Amino acid sequence: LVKNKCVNFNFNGLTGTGVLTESNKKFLPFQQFGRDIADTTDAVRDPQTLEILDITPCSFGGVSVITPGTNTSNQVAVLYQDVNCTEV
């Protein structure tokens, strides 16, 4: 298990992509999956040690580009939408 890294996890039958983090979700001692009103996998109980990991889909987002007119300048700034500052 590795936390805070976008991985392709395969907890039992459940497979999927995302970053997984330790969580305070109080699973009942029998529950395995996590879900939400969107019916998507939110958290997961670690099968071999009973720990709770919420699954954030690892960061995506649009890449907007801020540019003046080409005739003005070729300098460009970029805007990674819906993401912190990760890779530059």
Binding site: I37, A38, D39, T40
Partner: protein, 48 residues
Amino acid sequence: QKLIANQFNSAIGKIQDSLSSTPSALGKLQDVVNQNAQALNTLVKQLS
């Protein structure tokens, strides 16, 4: 002028109370948000 000012202040105070007593007073806004959420929720219930 004094009566108009008193009526104006009282009517504004009632506006505060009406919006407090009536949360639905903002249904026209809340419905908009609900419609968007429902559409997004429906758009996610299609990958199931």
